[PDB]
Amino acid sequence: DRVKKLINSQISLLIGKGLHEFDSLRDPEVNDFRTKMRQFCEEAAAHRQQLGWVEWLQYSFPLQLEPSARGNRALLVNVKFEGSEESFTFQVSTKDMPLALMACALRKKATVFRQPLVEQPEEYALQVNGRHEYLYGNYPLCHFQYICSCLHSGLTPHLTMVHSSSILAMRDEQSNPASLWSLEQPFSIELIEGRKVNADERMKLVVQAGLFHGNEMLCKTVSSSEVNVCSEPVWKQRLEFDISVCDLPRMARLCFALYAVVDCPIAWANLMLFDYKDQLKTGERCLYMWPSVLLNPAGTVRGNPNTESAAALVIYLPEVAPHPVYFPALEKILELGRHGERGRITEEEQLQLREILERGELYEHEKDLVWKMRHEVQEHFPEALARLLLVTKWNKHEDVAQMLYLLCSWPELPVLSALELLDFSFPDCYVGSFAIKSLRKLTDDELFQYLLQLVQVLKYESYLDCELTKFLLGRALANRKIGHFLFWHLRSEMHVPSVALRFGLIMEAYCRGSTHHMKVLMKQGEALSKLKALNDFVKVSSQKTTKPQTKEMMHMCMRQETYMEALSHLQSPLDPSTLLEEVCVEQCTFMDSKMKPLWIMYSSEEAGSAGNVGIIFKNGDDLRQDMLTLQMIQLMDVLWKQEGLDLRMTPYGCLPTGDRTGLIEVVLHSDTIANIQLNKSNMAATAAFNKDALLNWLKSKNPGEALDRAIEEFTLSCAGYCVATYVLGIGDRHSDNIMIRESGQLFHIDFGHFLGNRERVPFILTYDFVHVIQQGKTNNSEKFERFRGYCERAYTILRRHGLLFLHLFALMRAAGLPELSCSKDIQYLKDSLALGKTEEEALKHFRVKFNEALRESWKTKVN
Numbered sequence: 001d002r003v004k005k006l007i008n009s010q011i012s013l014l015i016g017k018g019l020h021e022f023d024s025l026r027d028p029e030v031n032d033f034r035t036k037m038r039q040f041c042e043e044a045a046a047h048r049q050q051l052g053w054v055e056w057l058q059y060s061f062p063l064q065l066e067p068s069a070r071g072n073r074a075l076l077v078n079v080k081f082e083g084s085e086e087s088f089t090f091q092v093s094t095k096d097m098p099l100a101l102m103a104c105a106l107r108k109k110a111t112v113f114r115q116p117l118v119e120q121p122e123e124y125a126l127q128v129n130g131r132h133e134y135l136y137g138n139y140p141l142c143h144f145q146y147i148c149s150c151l152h153s154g155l156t157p158h159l160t161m162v163h164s165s166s167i168l169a170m171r172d173e174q175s176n177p178a179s180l181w182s183l184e185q186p187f188s189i190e191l192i193e194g195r196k197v198n199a200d201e202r203m204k205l206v207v208q209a210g211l212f213h214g215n216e217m218l219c220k221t222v223s224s225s226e227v228n229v230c231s232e233p234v235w236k237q238r239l240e241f242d243i244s245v246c247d248l249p250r251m252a253r254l255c256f257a258l259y260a261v262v263d264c265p266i267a268w269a270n271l272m273l274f275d276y277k278d279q280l281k282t283g284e285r286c287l288y289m290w291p292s293v294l295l296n297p298a299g300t301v302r303g304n305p306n307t308e309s310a311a312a313l314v315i316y317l318p319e320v321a322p323h324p325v326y327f328p329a330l331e332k333i334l335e336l337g338r339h340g341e342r343g344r345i346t347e348e349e350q351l352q353l354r355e356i357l358e359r360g361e362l363y364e365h366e367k368d369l370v371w372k373m374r375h376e377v378q379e380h381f382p383e384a385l386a387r388l389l390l391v392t393k394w395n396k397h398e399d400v401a402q403m404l405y406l407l408c409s410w411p412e413l414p415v416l417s418a419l420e421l422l423d424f425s426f427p428d429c430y431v432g433s434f435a436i437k438s439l440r441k442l443t444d445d446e447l448f449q450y451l452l453q454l455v456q457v458l459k460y461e462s463y464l465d466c467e468l469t470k471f472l473l474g475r476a477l478a479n480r481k482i483g484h485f486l487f488w489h490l491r492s493e494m495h496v497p498s499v500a501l502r503f504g505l506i507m508e509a510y511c512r513g514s515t516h517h518m519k520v521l522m523k524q525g526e527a528l529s530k531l532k533a534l535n536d537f538v539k540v541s542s543q544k545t546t547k548p549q550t551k552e553m554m555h556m557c558m559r560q561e562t563y564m565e566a567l568s569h570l571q572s573p574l575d576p577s578t579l580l581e582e583v584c585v586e587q588c589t590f591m592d593s594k595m596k597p598l599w600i601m602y603s604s605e606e607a608g609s610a611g612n613v614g615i616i617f618k619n620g621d622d623l624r625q626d627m628l629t630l631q632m633i634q635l636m637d638v639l640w641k642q643e644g645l646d647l648r649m650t651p652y653g654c655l656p657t658g659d660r661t662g663l664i665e666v667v668l669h670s671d672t673i674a675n676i677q678l679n680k681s682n683m684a685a686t687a688a689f690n691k692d693a694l695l696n697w698l699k700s701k702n703p704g705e706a707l708d709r710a711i712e713e714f715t716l717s718c719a720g721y722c723v724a725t726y727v728l729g730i731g732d733r734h735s736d737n738i739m740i741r742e743s744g745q746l747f748h749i750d751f752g753h754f755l756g757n758r759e760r761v762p763f764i765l766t767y768d769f770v771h772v773i774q775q776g777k778t779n780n781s782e783k784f785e786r787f788r789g790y791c792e793r794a795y796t797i798l799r800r801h802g803l804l805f806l807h808l809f810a811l812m813r814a815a816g817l818p819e820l821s822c823s824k825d826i827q828y829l830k831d832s833l834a835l836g837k838t839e840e841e842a843l844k845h846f847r848v849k850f851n852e853a854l855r856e857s858w859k860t861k862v863n
């Protein structure tokens with residue numbers, strides 16, 4: 001009671017919407033979602049509280065493994081026991097398993113504490129000091145990301161031996177507290193009136209209406225007559241459609257567009273013809289319209305919540321029968337679709353089908369052949385399900401029944417095929433259920449990689465309670481890291497009225513499943529609330545006084561009790577493994593740019609050097625495109641690493657958390673090309689030629705024999721970013737948005753422009769970078785051509801996974817990013833990856849592009 005009221009207020013606070021608002025809608029679909037999902041999430045919570053201590057480690061601290069390890073050398077490791085000042089430094093092998101290291105730590109403990117220990121190594125897990133990261137399982141140490149990272153940076157792994165009893169105490173502490181097909185008449189509606197309409201009174205108003213199954217039209221669009229512009233237009237007219245009521249598919253949507261004619265688009269609104277309980281809709285419907293920026297089928301099927309200002313279309317859905325009409329059950333659908341005729345075809349016409357299912361638009365006659373050979377598609381080309389689904393006449397209830405009968409016995413498709421099936425071009429609910437069914441085999445790592453896309457797919461859903469929401473919720477309550485990012489992806493969009501309800505409802509259900517995590521995320525939102533007020537203070541102060549003055553003001557404001565409490569001891573929203581412990585006020589600052597982004601520095605005694613981390617708070621900028629570009633770069637990095645290619649990439653964290661609000665992970669010991677090239681006097685890098693500056697800077701960071709490895713890190717990362725920016729169409733590249741790490745690694749930042757948004761972005765080769773690759777020499781084709789090789793190999797690996805990028809970017813069209821709104825944006829990727837070409841023709845083309853970029857580079861070498 002007292003705890004329930006408290007939990008409810010904390011959820012309202014966290015999700016940024018009062019739960020009372022859900023109740024005030026007096027909406028049965030909303031109410032059934034809350035009840036079913038609360039039950040489902042509490043069941044997951046109860047399952048979790050009883051997990052074994054290693055299972056609970058898999059839940060809270062899922063393994064962070066190297067991409068090549070998924071599906072020799074000597075190493076120095078520092079190991080301590082929980083709450084011990086003492087530590088042991090010992091030499092292991094990168095090929096040893098954590099258990100050997102633990103047995104080793106236990107023998108050292110037994111000799112030092114003069115007692116033959118009861119404790120077996122099986123009773124322990126290894127924590128990475130001052131991080132929510134553990135090393136466990138039957139994997140050699142080189143396979144864990146943390147060890148791998150330690151090996152490259154030369155640093156020593158610092159591990160803490162944590163006992164099962166301590167892990168169990170964590171689990172305990174974090175518990176939740178105690179018949180349609182007979183109706184042959186054409187589909188029709190009555191267009192009654194419009195309310196709160198705004199337009200030029202010299203013009204006339206028209207309502208355009210159309211029936212859609214996803215993107216595809218179910219019949220021709222039908223328009224209203226030209227009624228005079230006014231606030232309350234009255235039509236009171238029948239809009240009759242060319243399609244029988246019996247042929248309306250389950251996921252049929254009626255789409256409206258109100259506009260003004262002399263074309264002036266005013267508003268749009270959509271609705272599903274069947275409700276969430278599968279009942280065909282009857283009665284009056286007031287549709288609170290969305291303003292138009294003509295028909296929008298991909299647009300939400302729920303009304304505009306701003307009922308005070310919204311234009312509203314009033315329509316009537318006629319009572320087609322004296323009793324309620326429901327969409328037929330699956331058993332009734334399979335019955336009708338059972339009855340068919342199998343395609344008896346010629347060896348030559350069988351060859352024509354193999355040619356098109358292995359080939360992408362088709363001519364009308366090719367569709368007639370794919371349809372006729374639907375049984376052969378199921379049995380010999382199951383991966384061609386998507387092509388067949390697109391030839392199905394979704395406006396014929398019998399063709400839909402024949403399609404559903406096959407789909408219901410269709411074998412589970414690979415993950416790649418299932419992602420294509422989540423596209424809005426497959427709106428059928430049975431197709432969507434099938435697609436999730438084939439996605440169940442996703443590993444938490446694969447799931448995490450595509451989570452951003454699965455969250456966007458939620459915007460295409462017609463109903464609140466769906467297989468994808470249940471899937472996303474079940475996977476998030478089974479993995480704390482999936483849970484963390486599902487939360488933030490939904491939270492960052494609560495300011496969007498079209499998704500606020502759906503997203504707020506998912507976050508509440510999630511919270512019901514993990515009370516403890518809700519409190520952890522509240523601690524994160526509290527820190528972001530203070531960073532917003534701090535960034536506002538900085539934005540005001542900076543335009544009045546100088547930068548060292550505003551910086552000292554920011555520090556004073558951070559030194560306040562409420563800022564010290566809220567900004568300290570939190571999990572990073574960028575990475576729940578990263579503990580943001582003590583705020584280093586003196587190290588904090590902000591940028592001189594328009595939005596004055598804040599740079600917040602942290603340290604942790606327990607984590608040592610690894611505890612020294614930074615976050616960038618941005619308010620005023622939109623970080624969604626950055627996050628998408630950075631996730632795509634990370635995807636490239638994983639794909640190259642699986643093919644044994646490590647291009648030393650830096651896919652740093654980027655996370656929108658609110659309205660034009662988000663975080664960026666600071667990469668320490670890095671500087672921009674512009675700052676290095678300023679060629680300051682009295683520096684360890686000052687050059688005789690500005691071309692030497694960046695090489696002199698690497699020289700000062702990597703003394704003696706260390707220079708060669710820095711140059712190699714530069715070359716690899718350069719080849720990786722050359723390919724990544726080319727494939728992605730990253731333009732507006734200048735010296736202040738390219739950085740370099742002291743290790744030699746080059747990386748790109750600020751990705752506000754991609755997919756050539758519209759001009760085709762050519763391949764880029766910079767002479768200052770070509771100069772580093774060549775080890776300071778004018779001619780060094782040995783080093784330069786090793787670079788061109790890294791480029792060609794990285795490019796040819798991406799092309800092999802070109803469909804993965806296409807399917808993911810197609811899913812992202814749902815995000816509403818202005819540079820990713822239509823089909824032409826995906827065309828850019830098809831071109832850069834030359835997917836209609838052989839590997840020979842594409843590499844030939846890549847070479848022409850790389851050589852073109854070198855002739856462009858030599859225009860600077862001339863001087």
Ligand SMILES: CS(=O)(=O)Nc1cc(C2=CCOCC2)cnc1Cl
Binds near residue numbers: 749
């Ligand atoms: C210069 S800024 O205003 O802070 N903007 C920015 C910085 C960065 C990083 C700097 C060093 O760490 C890696 C990430 C990344 N993106 C942006 Cl857009």
